[PDB]
Design an enzyme around this catalytic site. Sequence first.
Site, PDB file in Angstrom:
ATOM      1  N   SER A 123      -3.871 -39.880  18.541  1.00 29.56           N
ATOM      2  CA  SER A 123      -2.925 -38.952  18.029  1.00 29.56           C
ATOM      3  C   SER A 123      -3.652 -37.969  17.006  1.00 29.56           C
ATOM      4  CB  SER A 123      -1.708 -39.524  17.774  1.00 29.56           C
ATOM      5  OG  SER A 123      -0.695 -38.234  17.374  1.00 29.56           O
ATOM      6  N   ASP A 130       2.851 -37.415  28.384  1.00 31.90           N
ATOM      7  CA  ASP A 130       3.162 -37.517  27.122  1.00 31.90           C
ATOM      8  C   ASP A 130       4.173 -36.421  26.809  1.00 31.90           C
ATOM      9  OD1 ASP A 130       2.906 -37.794  24.168  1.00 31.90           O
ATOM     10  OD2 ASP A 130       0.933 -38.296  24.151  1.00 31.90           O
ATOM     11  N   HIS A 141       3.239 -41.041  25.334  1.00 31.20           N
ATOM     12  CA  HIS A 141       2.135 -41.255  24.217  1.00 31.20           C
ATOM     13  C   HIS A 141       1.446 -42.781  23.850  1.00 31.20           C
ATOM     14  CE1 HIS A 141       0.566 -39.900  20.473  1.00 31.20           C
ATOM     15  NE2 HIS A 141       1.161 -40.663  19.920  1.00 31.20           N
TER      16      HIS A 141
HETATM   17  C1  LIG Z   1      -0.017 -38.580  16.284  1.00 31.62           C
HETATM   18  O1  LIG Z   1      -0.305 -39.100  15.082  1.00 31.62           O
HETATM   19  C2  LIG Z   1       1.663 -38.193  15.993  1.00 31.62           C
HETATM   20  C3  LIG Z   1       1.355 -36.650  15.271  1.00 31.62           C
HETATM   21  C4  LIG Z   1       0.429 -35.580  15.756  1.00 31.62           C
HETATM   22  C5  LIG Z   1       2.325 -38.026  17.436  1.00 31.62           C
HETATM   23  C6  LIG Z   1       3.602 -38.093  17.630  1.00 31.62           C
HETATM   24  C7  LIG Z   1       2.308 -39.073  15.139  1.00 31.62           C
HETATM   25  O2  LIG Z   1       2.532 -38.497  13.958  1.00 31.62           O
HETATM   26  N1  LIG Z   1       2.459 -40.281  15.441  1.00 31.62           N
HETATM   27  C8  LIG Z   1       3.124 -41.629  14.928  1.00 31.62           C
HETATM   28  C9  LIG Z   1       3.036 -42.444  15.589  1.00 31.62           C
HETATM   29  C10 LIG Z   1       3.678 -43.738  14.898  1.00 31.62           C
HETATM   30  C11 LIG Z   1       4.285 -43.759  13.660  1.00 31.62           C
HETATM   31  C12 LIG Z   1       4.186 -42.246  12.784  1.00 31.62           C
HETATM   32  C13 LIG Z   1       4.930 -42.197  11.391  1.00 31.62           C
HETATM   33  N2  LIG Z   1       6.144 -41.748  11.305  1.00 31.62           N
HETATM   34  C14 LIG Z   1       6.407 -40.431  12.000  1.00 31.62           C
HETATM   35  C15 LIG Z   1       7.876 -39.720  12.088  1.00 31.62           C
HETATM   36  C16 LIG Z   1       8.337 -40.089  10.566  1.00 31.62           C
HETATM   37  C17 LIG Z   1       9.633 -39.551  10.444  1.00 31.62           C
HETATM   38  C18 LIG Z   1      10.367 -39.828   9.350  1.00 31.62           C
HETATM   39  C19 LIG Z   1       9.707 -41.069   8.455  1.00 31.62           C
HETATM   40  C20 LIG Z   1       8.687 -41.456   8.708  1.00 31.62           C
HETATM   41  C21 LIG Z   1       7.960 -41.433   9.871  1.00 31.62           C
HETATM   42  C22 LIG Z   1       6.445 -41.871  10.207  1.00 31.62           C
HETATM   43  O3  LIG Z   1      10.848 -40.909   7.229  1.00 31.62           O
HETATM   44  C23 LIG Z   1      11.945 -40.229   7.577  1.00 31.62           C
HETATM   45  O4  LIG Z   1      11.468 -39.443   8.720  1.00 31.62           O
HETATM   46  C24 LIG Z   1       3.697 -41.368  13.804  1.00 31.62           C
END
Ligand SMILES: *C(=O)C(CC)(CC)C(=O)Nc1cccc(CN2CCc3cc4c(cc3C2)OCO4)c1
Lengths: 827, 828
Positions: free
Chosen positions: B686, B764, B796
Amino acid sequence: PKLEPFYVERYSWSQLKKLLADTRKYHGYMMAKAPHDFMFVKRNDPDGPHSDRIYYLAMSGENRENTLFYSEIPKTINRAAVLMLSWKPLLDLVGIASYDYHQGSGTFLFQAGSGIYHVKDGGPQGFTQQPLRPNLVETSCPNIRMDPKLCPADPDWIAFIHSNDIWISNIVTREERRLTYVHNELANMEEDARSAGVATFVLQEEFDRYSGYWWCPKAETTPSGGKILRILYEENDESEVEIIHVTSPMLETRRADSFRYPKTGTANPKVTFKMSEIMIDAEGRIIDVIDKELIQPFEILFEGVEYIARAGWTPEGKYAWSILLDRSQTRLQIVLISPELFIPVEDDVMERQRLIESVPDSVTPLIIYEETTDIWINIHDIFHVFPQSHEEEIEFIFASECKTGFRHLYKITSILKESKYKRSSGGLPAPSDFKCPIKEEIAITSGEWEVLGRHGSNIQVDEVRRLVYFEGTKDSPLEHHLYVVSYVNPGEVTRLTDRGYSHSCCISQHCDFFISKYSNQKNPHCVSLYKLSSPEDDPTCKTKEFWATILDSAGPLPDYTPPEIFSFESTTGFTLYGMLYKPHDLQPGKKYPTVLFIYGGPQVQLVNNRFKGVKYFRLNTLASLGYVVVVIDNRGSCHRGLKFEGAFKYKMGQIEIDDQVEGLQYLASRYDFIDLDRVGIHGWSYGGYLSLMALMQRSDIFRVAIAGAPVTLWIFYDTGYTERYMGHPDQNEQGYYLGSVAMQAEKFPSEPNRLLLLHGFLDENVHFAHTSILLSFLVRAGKPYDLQIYPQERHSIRVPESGEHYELHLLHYLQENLGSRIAALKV
Amino acid sequence: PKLEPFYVERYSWSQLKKLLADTRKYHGYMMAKAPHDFMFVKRNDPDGPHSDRIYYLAMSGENRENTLFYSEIPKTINRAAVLMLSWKPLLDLFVGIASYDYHQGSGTFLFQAGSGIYHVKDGGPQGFTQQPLRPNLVETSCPNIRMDPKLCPADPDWIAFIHSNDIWISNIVTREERRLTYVHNELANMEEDARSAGVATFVLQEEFDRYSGYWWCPKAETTPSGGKILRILYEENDESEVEIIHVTSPMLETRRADSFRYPKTGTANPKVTFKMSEIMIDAEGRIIDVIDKELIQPFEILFEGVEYIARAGWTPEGKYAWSILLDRSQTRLQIVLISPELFIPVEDDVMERQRLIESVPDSVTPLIIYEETTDIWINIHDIFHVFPQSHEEEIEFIFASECKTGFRHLYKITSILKESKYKRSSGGLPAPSDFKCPIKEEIAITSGEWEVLGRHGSNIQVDEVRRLVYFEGTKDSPLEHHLYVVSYVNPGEVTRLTDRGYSHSCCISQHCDFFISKYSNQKNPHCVSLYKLSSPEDDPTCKTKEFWATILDSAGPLPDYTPPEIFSFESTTGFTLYGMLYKPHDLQPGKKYPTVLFIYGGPQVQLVNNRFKGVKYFRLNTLASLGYVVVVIDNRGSCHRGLKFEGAFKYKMGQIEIDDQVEGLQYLASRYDFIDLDRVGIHGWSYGGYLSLMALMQRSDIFRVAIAGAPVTLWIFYDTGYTERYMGHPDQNEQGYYLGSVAMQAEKFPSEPNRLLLLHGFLDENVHFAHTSILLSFLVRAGKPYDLQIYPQERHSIRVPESGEHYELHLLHYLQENLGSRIAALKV
Ligand SMILES: *C(=O)C(CC)(CC)C(=O)Nc1cccc(CN2CCc3cc4c(cc3C2)OCO4)c1
Ligand SMILES: *C(=O)C(CC)(CC)C(=O)Nc1cccc(CN2CCc3cc4c(cc3C2)OCO4)c1
Ligand SMILES: CCC1(CC)C(=O)N(c2cccc(CN3CCc4cc5c(cc4C3)OCO5)c2)C1=O
Ligand SMILES: CCC1(CC)C(=O)N(c2cccc(CN3CCc4cc5c(cc4C3)OCO5)c2)C1=O
Ligand SMILES: [Cl-]
Ligand SMILES: [Cl-]
C-alpha cells in the site's frame, strides 16, 4: 557423442535495445503495402498506343498513405528490354482500404478516413492524364459512415452504414435518407441490441464477412417512368447474446466496455433477411421507401440455419442467393431467395394477412445445392452464377472439400420446380420440401491438392472461351500457382505461373492478362504483368508472355540469412514440412540452444516457399545471436486437405506437440548442433496455447515456454470457431477438459524461469481472463510463473513502443533462461 | 576494511515451499483472537463469593469460532498464589460473533452470528446462569442478509437492523417486524437506485472508521394514551453524483465487472442529510404508526460548509442528538447539537408542509457547542463524553483535540445554549456564525509532548462519583501505550496505572473499580490480566492498582523467534527517529550481509514500538534466519509523535519519507559493518509499496531491488477522504500531486532488470489494479523492465491461504535470486 555447449553473448537490457533498434533500422523500407485490388479497363483507341489502363491500391513509400494509382498497358512491347511500369497517382492531396467501381459511368467510390469520396475515370468521360480531385459526398449524419457501396444499377446512388442502420445518399442530387430504424445511438447497448446491414462479431472474426447488405444489380422500371432499387440486408438481434466486459483503453476511467460475446454453447445472434424497396421517380428523386420482411419466419423458411455465411444476387437481379450453415457447420446450403418472398412490414393484422395471401404458393425458397461432411465445412469466396438460359434451370460453379476431401471446382445445374409444400394449407414445411434436384454435377478438377478460395484467392470465368482460372496447390503444397481449365469438357490443367516461387494472382476481367505477386525463401516480393494468348488451332490451350514489371523486388537483404525448408515422413503416415534456421557462423564441434516458434492451429500454414524476411525477420535475428530456430506445420494446418486438417477434431491440444517433437527429433539425429537439453518454445494465440501444452505435456523436451495470448480454456472462446473444431461442450466433455490448459495447472513445472505469459490487457478475442484464470489455478497449485502485460493493446500489437518492449523482453528472457552462460548455471 | 560478502543458501522453489510450510506449521496457536469487548456486571449477592461477572469475546483455541464467554470475579483472593480465571461458555452453539449489545436493566444480549441475529439473557433481574444458554433466533420475513443489529436502549424488546440499505425494526417478544425507510430497491440497478439509509458509505467506512449510520434515542417519550415514542436518528445518503468505476468480479468465468461508487479525489462525495424516524408504540407494545421526519431546512443551510458526518449519537437523557462534522478540507471540526424539534414530517403537499414549518419556533436551532480549526488536519477519534444537564441553558462535556498544542489532550468544556440571532420567520438565510454557542469554560485536563489515544478501541472512562477520567497515552514513551488517570475538576498530575516495560491496551469497568490490560513487549507475547483499583482513605483522587487474576496467560518465548532490537537516532530534521533491527542469525565475524528494508511509512500507523512482533511480523525473523539484515524505520508522518511530526509531509507525500529511511539506514551501516549497502532491498504494501517504488526511482544508488505491493502510483485515483486530508484538492496542489505520483515519473526507473517487482490483488477495491496497470503502461513506453505478480482471487488484503503462501514463496525466492544469493551478485 559429447559436444560442447555454445552460450549466447550476454548483452544487458540497454545493449539488446540498441541491437534491436539498429537491426530494425535496416529494414522498414519493405514494410509498405504492395500493389493490390487490381482492375483492368480497356482504352478502345485504334490510333492510341495503349490497350488497357490498370487501377490499383498501393503504398508509395514507407510512411505515405495507401491510395489509388494507375499504370498504362501498351499494345506492344520491346521484347529485348524489360518494361518497368510507372505509377501515376489517380488522386490529388486518410488511407484507402478498398474501392468500388461502375464500368458504364467510370465512377470510383471509396472511404478515406472519415470521408466518403468519388471520382470518374475510364468511362464515357474518358481518361485523365493528371491526378483527379476527390469529390466529398456531403452528409447531415453526425457519426462516422462505414461500408460505402455504389449501386450497380445506378451510379448516382450509394449506400452506407451509420450507427448500425442503412442509409442511402445521391451523389448528384445531394439527397440523403435513412432506410432502417432499428438502432438508437442514445440508448445503452444492454437495451438496444439490434442492427441492420452489419455483420456481428463472430461473422467478422470467424467467417470473414464484414458487409451485411447487398445492392440488387438491376432496377425494375416503373409505369411512371422511374425505377425501383433494392437492397437485401441481414438484421441481427443480439439481445439473448451474453454480455461480457472488457477493460476500456482509457485506463484512467477505471471502467469497462460492454460487448456481445457469443461464448461457445450459448446463443448466437437472432438473424433474418430483409429487403428495402426504394421507389425512385424519373428525376432520380425518392418517391417512397417500403421496408419488407420474409413472408414467414427465417426459422421456418431456412430450417436448421444458424449462420448466414455469404450472400448476394444473381447477375440479372432475378433472385438473391445465400450460403447458409447449420450450428455444427457440417451442412452447407446454397439457397435462392426471390424478392417475391418479401412483403411490406405491417402492424395491422387485417392488412398483413391479406398481403400474405397475395403472394403465390409456388413462390418458395429454392435450395439449389446442399452438402454435408463429418469433419467441417470451410467457408470460401468462390461462387459463380452463369446467365439464365431457361426459366426452369440455374447453372453455377462452386467449390467443395465434401466429396474427395480436397477443395475442387464443380459445375452444377439445378432445376427450379414448384415445391410440394403449399402455403395456403397452413402447415409447416418439411425438411426437404425446398430442395431442388441436381440435373448435372461435373467435376472441373480433382487430385490430392486443393483449389484456393480464401484471402483474395478466387476464380475468373471466361464465358467466351468457356474456361476457369484458379489458384491451387497441384504442383506443391509449398507453392500457390495460377492454373486454367475448361469448365465444359474438363480435360487437363495448364499451370500458368513459374515454379520456384509461390504466387498470389488476379486475372483481368477481360481474361487476356493476369498479375502475380510472387516471392520465395531467398527473394523478396515482386509484382509482374503477364499477357495471355491462344494458339489459333485451339482456344482452350493457354500460354503466357511476360509484359511488364509493376513492383520490382529489393533483392537479398543485408544480414538476412533465410531458412531451409525440410521435411520428414511422420509415423502418422504424413509428410510434415518444416523450416530450419542454422546459427550464423556455425562453430564445428559445438551444440547450440534451440527456439521452436509455433502456431499449429487451423487455417494457417507457416511453412512454404515465400519470403519470411519481412514478418519473421526476428527468427533470423535469433539465429544471428546463436539460436537454432525451428518451425513445423503439424497436423491440423491448412493446404493439405480436409483429412489432414481434421486430425484434431474434438481433440485440440492432444496431437499437436507429438508432431512438433517428432520433427524436432528428426533434426537432432541428423544435425548434431541442435542441443536438446536447451529447447525453448514460443507462439501467439493458438501458438501460445500449444506453448503451454508443450511445457505441461513434455517438460522433458522444453526448458522454457513463452505463451503469447493463450487460449487456456475453450469454454471462454466464441461459437463460430470452437464449435467448428470441438463441437458443443455437452457433446465433448472429455475434449474440452483435456484441451483446456487451465484445468490441468498441477501438471506445470514446480521450478521457476520456465513459464512466461504475455497478454494484451484489452484483448477482445482472447480475453485476459484466459491468463488471469490460469494464474489463479497456478497460484492454488503452488506453481511459479512470469508475467508481462501490454496495457494499451488488444490481440495484435499496434503501438510501436509495445512491440519494441515485447522484442526486447523476449530476447532478454531467452538469453537469461535458455541460451546464455548464466542460464545453465541456474538449473 | 572491505569484509567478505555472505551469500544466502540458494534453495529451490520446492525447498523454500517446504521451509516456509515447516516454520508456520510449528505455530498456528498464535492465530487466535485474544479476549476483548469486555463488560463488567455486578452480582449484588452479600452471601455469594463473587463481586462481578465479566463477559467478553474470545476464540477458544486455534481454528474455532469467536464467541461469548464469561468469568467470575471473586470478592477476595489468595495473595500468595496467582488466580487463573476459567472461561465459561455463555452460548450453547447448536458462524462467529464480531460484536454484541447489552441492556443493563433487563440482561438482554443481542448479536449477529453469521446470517442470524440472536439474543439471550444473563445478569439482569433474571439472575446468572451456571450453564451455557441457548441463543434465541430473531425470526424474520426479510429475504436477504440483516446487518448492523442494535438493541433499543429505551426498550429491550425492540431491535433495529439494516436490510437492503433500509432501516427495519423488529420486536423479539411480540414478533412484529416492520420497515421504516423506503429509500432503496433491491430489484433496480445501482446506476439508477443510488440511495441508502442507516449505512455509512465507502469513504466513511474505509477513511473515518464509521460503519453504523443510525442511532437509537436512549429514552422513550411517554404518550397520553399510555404507550410511548421511540426515535431513531439516521443519515441518508444519495450517491447519484458519485463517480462509478468498475472492479473485476471474483467469478472470473463471467468476464464481468461489478459497478461501485468511488469518490475519486476532487470529485463529488455522497449527498448527505439527517433524518428522524418517530415510532408511536401503544401500551400493548405494538406499533400504532411510523412518522418519517426530515430537517426543517436543508442540510447545506443548517450545517453550512459541512461535507462529512464523522460521528453521531445522542445525549444521555435523549433531549439532544449530537454530531461531529467536518468540512471538505478536514481543517474545521464542529460538535453540533440537533434537537428532535428541528425535524418535521415528510409531506408532499406544499400547503400542509408550509404550515408545519411555521409550527416549529425560531428559538429551536442548531447549537454548535464546539468548533476548532487547524492548518495541518483534523484527526477524527472516538472520545466524546457528555455529562448530565444540571441547567437548561448549559451543556458540559469532555472532548480531545490536537488543535491547541499539536498533541492530542483532554479538555473539559462548558457551553451556553442561548437563542440564536437568526430567526426563521424572517425568510432569510443564516450567517456562518449564527449557530455558534459561547464557551463559558475550557479547562485543559492534560498537556505535554505526548498524546492521549482515541482510535482503534482506545477511549476514556469517566468516573462521575470520584470525578476522574481514565485514558490511554504516550506520556512515558512513544514506544509504549499506558493507562493513566487524572481529576477532571482540579486537573493535577496524572497517575500511570500500568507497569513499564510493556505496551498496553486497556478497558476500565463501567463501575471504575477494575481494569483489564492486553499487554506485550518485544520478547514476550500477548497477555491479558485483571487489576483491581483502590483509593487511599484520606484521598479518593489518588489511585493504586493491585493484581487480581490472569485471563489469558502468555505462551512465553517462541522456539526459533529471535526478536529485533529497538534503536534510535537524532535526525538532521531535528527529530528522534525510532527503528527496529533484526541481526542475521549465526552472525559470522568479518562478513557483510544483504539487507531488506521493510516499510510502511504512511500516516496513521507506527511499525516501531515495544510490542510482540513475532505473530504478524514473524516472517521478518524468517528473513533473519536465512542471513538477511532486516530494518524497519518510522519516518516523519507516522503516528504517536504529535500533529507537527505527522504534518511533515502535508502536500508533499513521497518527497520526504525516503530521506529518513536512508538516514537511519546509513546510521546503522556506520555503526554495524555487517550491513552490506551494495545489496539493499526494499518491500512494502500500500503506502509501503508506494514508498518502495519511490525508493528505487529516487535512490537507485542505495536500493538494488524494490518489491511494491498494491502501490499507489497516482494520487488522482485515490479516494476523497484520505488524499484530500493529506494532499488537499488537486487544483490547489498541482506540484505535489505530480511529484507524489510515481506513474508520472516512469522514465526515472532503472533501465536494468531484476530490480522492480509489482504485486497486486487483481480485485482490489481500495487501490484499484489500474494503479499498477497504468504504471506498467508508462514503463512500457519508456522501455523499462519490470517483474509482475497478480493474485487473481484477492482484494487489498490476502484472505485465501494459498495466495498468501504463494506471496511468501515468491518473495523469498525473488530476494534470493536477485539480492542475497551467490547467483544474484553474478547477474549484474
Ligand atoms: C495503504 O497504505 C492504504 C492507503 C493508500 C490502502 C487502504 C491504507 O491506508 N491502508 C491501511 C491498512 C490498514 C490500516 C490502516 C490504518 N487506518 C486507516 C483508516 C483509518 C480511519 C480512521 C482512524 C484510523 C485509521 C487507520 O481513526 C478514525 O478513522 C491503513
Ligand atoms: C489465435 O490463434 C486465434 C484463435 C484462438 C485468435 C483470434 C486466431 O485464430 N488468430 C488468427 C490471427 C490471424 C489470422 C488468423 C487466420 N484466420 C482466422 C479467421 C478466418 C476466417 C475465415 C477464413 C480464414 C480465416 C483465417 O476463411 C473464411 O472465414 C487467425
Ligand atoms: C497472427 C497470425 C500469425 C500467422 C500468420 C501468427 O501466429 N503470427 C505471429 C505470432 C507471433 C509472432 C509473430 C512475429 N514474431 C515472430 C517471432 C518473434 C521472435 C522474436 C521477436 C519478434 C518476433 C515476431 O523478437 C525477439 O524474438 C507472428 C502471425 O502473423
Ligand atoms: C495493513 C497495515 C499494516 C500495519 C499494521 C501493514 O502495513 N502491514 C503489512 C504490510 C505488508 C506485509 C505485512 C506482513 N508481512 C511482513 C513482511 C513479510 C516478508 C516476507 C514474507 C511475509 C511477510 C508478511 O515472506 C517472505 O518475506 C504486513 C500491516 O499489517
Ligand atoms: Cl456457359
Ligand atoms: Cl460532574
